[PDB]
Amino acid sequence: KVTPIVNPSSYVCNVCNARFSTMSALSEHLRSDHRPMINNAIRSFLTAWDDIRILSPDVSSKSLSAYLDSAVANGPELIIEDTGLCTSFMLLDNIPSAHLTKELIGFTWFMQMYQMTPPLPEGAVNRIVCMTNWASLGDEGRGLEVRLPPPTDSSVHAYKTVLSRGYIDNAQFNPLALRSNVLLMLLQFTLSNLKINKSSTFTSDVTTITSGRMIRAFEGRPELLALAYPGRAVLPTQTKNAQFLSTAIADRIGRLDRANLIGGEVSAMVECMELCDALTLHIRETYIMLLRSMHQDPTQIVQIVNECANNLLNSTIPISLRPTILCPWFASSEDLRLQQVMHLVNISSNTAAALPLVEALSTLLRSVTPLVLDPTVLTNAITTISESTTQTISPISEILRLLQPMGNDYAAFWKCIASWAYNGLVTTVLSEDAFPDSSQSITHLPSMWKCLFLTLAGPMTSDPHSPVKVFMALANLLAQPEPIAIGVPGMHQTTPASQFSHPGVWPPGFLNPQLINPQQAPLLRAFAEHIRANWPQPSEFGYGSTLQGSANLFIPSNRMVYPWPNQPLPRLTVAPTYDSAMSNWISTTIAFFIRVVNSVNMTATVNDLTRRTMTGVMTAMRQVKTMTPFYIQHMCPTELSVLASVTVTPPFQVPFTRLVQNDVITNVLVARVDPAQRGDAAVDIRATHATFAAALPVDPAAIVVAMLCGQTETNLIPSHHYGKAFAPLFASNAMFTRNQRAVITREAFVCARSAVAQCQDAGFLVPRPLDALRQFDVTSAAAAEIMHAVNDAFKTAFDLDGALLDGLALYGDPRIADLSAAYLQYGGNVVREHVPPGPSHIHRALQQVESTFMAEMNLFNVARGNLYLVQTATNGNWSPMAPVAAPPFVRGGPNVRVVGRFGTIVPRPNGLEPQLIDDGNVPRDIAGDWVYPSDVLQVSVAVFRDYVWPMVKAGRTRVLVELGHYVYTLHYYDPQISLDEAPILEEWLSKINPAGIPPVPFCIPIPQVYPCITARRVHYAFTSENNNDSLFSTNAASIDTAFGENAAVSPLRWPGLVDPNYRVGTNDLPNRITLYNSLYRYNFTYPTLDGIMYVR
């Protein structure tokens, strides 16, 4: 059938044959027929339901925080431009004058009569309503917006954004969570409005209206050209707009100073005057000021890329001029720290998080390395030692059994290297199944060669208890010949060398080898002499660039500690040398186990000819010319300096420790909550912070193959081989993605911990401009909805996909959001290097919006001041929003009475009037002046409507409704027709719950153009404070308003258009908002790294 063109005028219920004029009437009556205990959950499911809103503070996604390599790899949208004009307030016409009942020729004049669109609205009520981006034709709008309906509508769905869905129904707003809902709208006002002002095109005004002024050329959209420029209005008749637009100064339009640089090239920054509020323009200019803060000039970003690549990459920049080159990619060193902790807060602090993170290096580490493992060399070094085959036990064959993995299993060496950048999260542990057991002796031959493989692979693994496990695995293995004293009791010498993972059970002989007697244990003192002398020195090196900064927390910035005494990278042909600390470590173990093999204990048991075989194997193993001693000292610290800034996470390091008892890093700790707000400032740091329990069981048999048998191509130039391998992973700007992440991680963190502490009472040191507003629910789960919604907005406005700000509610109390980090040493070093947020920009922007919200609350459909309910039966002008008289009966005045907490009428017998309990718990009579608090009237509303509200209609009492700030809904009527406000105002009383109130129905007459006869009418509701701050013009198309107020267009809104004393560049911004300002548009080109530099 044919599709319908118009909605049905009558809606059917089909249950009962009931006609409905409105679908909203059918929406309630179908809901009415659904309604014991069963129908209440059915009615509430249709009551508090809506999913059409963007923000979901009530949907608490449990453990959504999960770090991903692709989550940071998507950068946030920062460069969103605004080709249109940057105002947030459209001049909305509520009541056109065509809706006026009496119409005579010539009283009202329309521009539509002359085939022309008006610059200013033309009706009988013109409000200034907050509708963001109504004129913004910029590319790819910010997602979230706020679009308030005019005051004739309900205008409460913009104020149910948090703490309001399940608690109050649709027709109400929650006044005890009002400061939350208003401020979260202002965040939605700000982040919807973080655009870049872009100059479109500028033609000369060829026509006679301004005669040559460089007009904004809205080419394809003339319906916005007339609205951009009120100065180019045609003023045919004496419209009341034409009364105002006659005062428009002629040269306040178009561009003034095009700051161009290069002839032919697009200009840098024009300076034009057009229609814009003073508030959006402040949000735009602080966004460029944000966007310059991560900009660096191209002479300095080539120093960053070369220092990030350690100056072995061929990146050249042209030396010339480049006009418009915003390349915004540079978070400071402070902001990278704030993301790095936020990286560690999102993750699970077990081994489920570092184990993705190590192989992120180790995949790229094996991709670029020149070190080619080839285990044939150490095989050919051992199988070419001579052994008589007549023996029962072969020391050649019984150690290649303990040497070969079946697969490759050689990337575990490269995971062992890649864990050095991540020793804060994970500590690689010697694999417990590779320790020799506490059953076999030193005469048992494969048990000894395990202890060689542990001692060689000792300094590779980053566990702080590695050398005590190396020392004990031999001290276990010769407990019968050489006994010593082992620490506290319960840990004996035959404890199987894996349970010595605590610093308290290091033996005293290992700390001081003088405590081991050479006359008792000569072979075991010399192994304590071995480890304390030859264990490598924990050196350090730099990475990244000092200009960019780094996400180091405990290491000083742009540095990395390293468990080996490194040397800089050579650029000539390299050869395996024995000057390394590796070769110092390797040769002295073999020099120690040639002593153990040729000791007295092995002499009595092991045959002398097969003892020469073991000596011959290790001396062959010592003389294997392998490149890994040169590699770990020279070539490997270069690529751990390079890959530390191209992997998705910067290295989180904790300083290494060579055998110091008091400097063993027992725990590495990061908290989500500072110990000052909760009373935990003096307790142990393990109770205040969360700890990273991660470990990797590195197999030592695969390390010794990798360590003692590793070679490289003969003609290797290590600058060339690193310069060729690192080139595909610096050509893109994707390296700078985490800098764009870290600022948005900052700007969301500062603004969320503000928005929580704004809604608390005196939380962190944040300024509180909205503290006049009502906020009662300050609990954890209330503030959990606030931070989750701010998180829901920064993930929407910058439309990213990572996990920022999640996991700050892991413990469940985001009222205390402070990021700290620490590590405890066994001596009791309690470092606590905690990181505050940086000097953010959007937190300065929201703070300015909140300050200028308070001066113009009425502009956002929120009235301030109390509420008056007196019977005012008048005939003339009636202005509830602007009470021209003095506000009667202020609180505490002459015999004005304040109701106590219950709102309790006591009944009196035998014709006596019912008394009302006041604040002093005294029943006082109804007739008189009363003040009701808002919360008393929320629970006494049936007692109000039945006992003291009919006393208001009789005019014998007057009730003040004391409440701070409130959403108002205006109602209009033809004043020629009679009206009584009580059917309009009892509908307000009929929906006041104990949970929330509806917006307040003020009745206002439409201002008439004729001096017409007016009906006597009775009004009840009006306000005390002047709340008429959103009325733009009382009546526009008419020549003159007659009956209503003569509220013409205020020139205070427009200094930039009508004031001769207006200087370019001024605003009264904490006060009222100027709607026509001078500004700056931009023409930034957005180069890639190919547009900056050239990389071969």
Contact partners, residue 514, CB within 8 Å, separation at least 6: none
**716 touches, from its own copies, Zn ion, none (C-beta below 5 to 8 Å by class):** its own copies
**Nearest residue to 704 (alpha-carbon basis) of 608, 790, 801, 593:** 593
Q: What angle do CA 427, 429, 432 make, to 5 degrees?
A: 160
Task: Output 351 or 976, the one with its CB closest to its own copies.
Answer: 351
* Kind and range of the H or E run holding 969: strand 965-973
Task: Output 164 or 879, the one with its CB closest to its own copies.
Answer: 164
Q: Which of 72, 85, 131, 163 binds its own copies (CB under 8 A)?
A: 163
Q: How many whole angstroms separate alpha carbon 669 and alpha carbon 685? A: 8
Q: Which of 222, 504, 767, 812 binds its own copies (CB under 8 A)?
A: 812
- Per CB under 8 A, the segment of 231-239, 322-330, 567-575, 810-818 that binds its own copies is 810-818
- Per CB under 8 A, the segment of 458-466, 805-813, 979-987, 1073-1081 that binds its own copies is 805-813
- Residue in the structure block whose two tokens are 């954004």: 161
**259 touches, from Zn ion, its own copies, none (C-beta below 5 to 8 Å by class):** none
Which residues 687-706 are close enough to bind its own copies by CB under 8 A? Answer: 690-691, 693
Task: Output 120 or 381, the one with its CB closest to its own copies.
Answer: 381
Residue 167 binds its own copies (CB under 8 A): yes
Phi-psi region of 1053 (alpha: psi -120 to 50; beta: other; left: phi over 0): alpha
Strand order in the sheet with 820-825: 690-691, 665-671, 820-825
DSSP 729-762: GTSSGGGGHHHHHHHHHHHHHHHHHHHHHHHSSS
**166 touches, from Zn ion, its own copies, none (C-beta below 5 to 8 Å by class):** its own copies
**Nearest residue to 177 (alpha-carbon basis) of 168, 186, 187:** 168
Residue 13 binds Zn ion (CB under 5 A): yes
Q: DSSP 3-state assignment of 166? A: coil
Contact partners, residue 289, CB within 8 Å, separation at least 6: 841
- Rounded to a whole number of angstroms, the minimum distance from the CB of residue 407 to its own copies is 19
**13 touches, from its own copies, Zn ion, none (C-beta below 5 to 8 Å by class):** Zn ion
**16 touches, from Zn ion, its own copies, none (C-beta below 5 to 8 Å by class):** Zn ion
Which residues 372-391 are close enough to bind its own copies by CB under 8 A? Answer: 372, 376-377, 380-381, 383-387
- Rounded to a whole number of angstroms, the minimum distance from the CB of residue 39 to Zn ion is 14
**Nearest residue to 937 (alpha-carbon basis) of 913, 902, 907:** 902
Q: Which of 12, 21, 33, 207 binds Zn ion (CB under 5 A)?
A: 33
Which residues 776-795 are close enough to bind its own copies by CB under 8 A? Answer: 776-777, 779, 781-782, 785
* Rounded alpha-carbon distances, angstroms, from residue 1027 to 132, 860, 958, 1070: 22, 11, 21, 18
Residue 898 binds Zn ion (CB under 5 A): no
Number of helices (H), then strands (E), belonging to the chain: the values are 33, 36
Q: Which of 351, 440, 557, 760 binds its own copies (CB under 8 A)?
A: 351
- Rounded to a whole number of angstroms, the minimum distance from the CB of residue 189 to its own copies is 24
- Rounded to a whole number of angstroms, the minimum distance from the CB of residue 352 to its own copies is 8
Q: How many whole angstroms separate alpha carbon 950 and alpha carbon 1049? A: 40
Residue 14 binds Zn ion (CB under 5 A): no
Cα Rg of the chain, angstroms: 40
**Nearest residue to 812 (alpha-carbon basis) of 269, 179, 63, 1:** 63
Residue 717 binds its own copies (CB under 8 A): yes
Length of the chain: 1096
Spacing of C-alpha 538 from chain mean position: 37
Residue 28 binds Zn ion (CB under 5 A): no
Q: How many whole angstroms separate alpha carbon 833 and alpha carbon 685? A: 12
**328 touches, from its own copies, Zn ion, none (C-beta below 5 to 8 Å by class):** none
Q: How many whole angstroms separate alpha carbon 312 and alpha carbon 721? A: 10
**208 touches, from Zn ion, its own copies, none (C-beta below 5 to 8 Å by class):** none
- Rounded to a whole number of angstroms, the minimum distance from the CB of residue 379 to its own copies is 8
Residue 995 binds its own copies (CB under 8 A): yes
Residue 1063 binds its own copies (CB under 8 A): no
Tokens of 246: 């006659």
- Rounded to a whole number of angstroms, the minimum distance from the CB of residue 90 to its own copies is 34
How far separated are the first and last CA of the chain, in Å rounded?
66
Q: How many whole angstroms separate alpha carbon 940 and alpha carbon 935? A: 9
Task: Output 669 or 952, the one with its CB closest to its own copies.
Answer: 669
- Rounded to a whole number of angstroms, the minimum distance from the CB of residue 55 to its own copies is 15
**63 touches, from Zn ion, its own copies, none (C-beta below 5 to 8 Å by class):** its own copies
Q: Which of 124, 131, 176, 460 binds its own copies (CB under 8 A)?
A: 176
Which residues 71-130 are close enough to bind Zn ion by CB under 5 A? Answer: none
**376 touches, from Zn ion, its own copies, none (C-beta below 5 to 8 Å by class):** its own copies
Q: How many whole angstroms separate alpha carbon 636 and alpha carbon 641? A: 9
- Residue in the structure block whose two tokens are 């007692």: 943
Q: Contact, 180 vs 162, CB < 8 A?
A: yes
Task: Output 296 or 348, the one with its CB closest to its own copies.
Answer: 348
Residue 850 binds its own copies (CB under 8 A): no
Q: How many whole angstroms separate alpha carbon 773 and alpha carbon 757? A: 14
Tokens of 659: 């055998």
**950 touches, from its own copies, Zn ion, none (C-beta below 5 to 8 Å by class):** none
- Rounded to a whole number of angstroms, the minimum distance from the CB of residue 401 to its own copies is 19
**116 touches, from Zn ion, its own copies, none (C-beta below 5 to 8 Å by class):** none
**285 touches, from its own copies, Zn ion, none (C-beta below 5 to 8 Å by class):** none
Torsional sign, CA 475, 480, 481, 485: positive
Task: Output 167 or 947, the one with its CB closest to its own copies.
Answer: 167
Q: How many whole angstroms separate alpha carbon 273 and alpha carbon 271? A: 7
Binding residues vs Zn ion (CB under 5 A) = 13, 15-16, 33
Binding residues vs its own copies (CB under 8 A) = 58, 62-63, 163, 166-167, 174, 176-177, 347-351, 372, 376-377, 380-381, 383-387, 690-691, 693, 712-717, 720, 723, 776-777, 779, 781-782, 785, 810-812, 939, 994-995
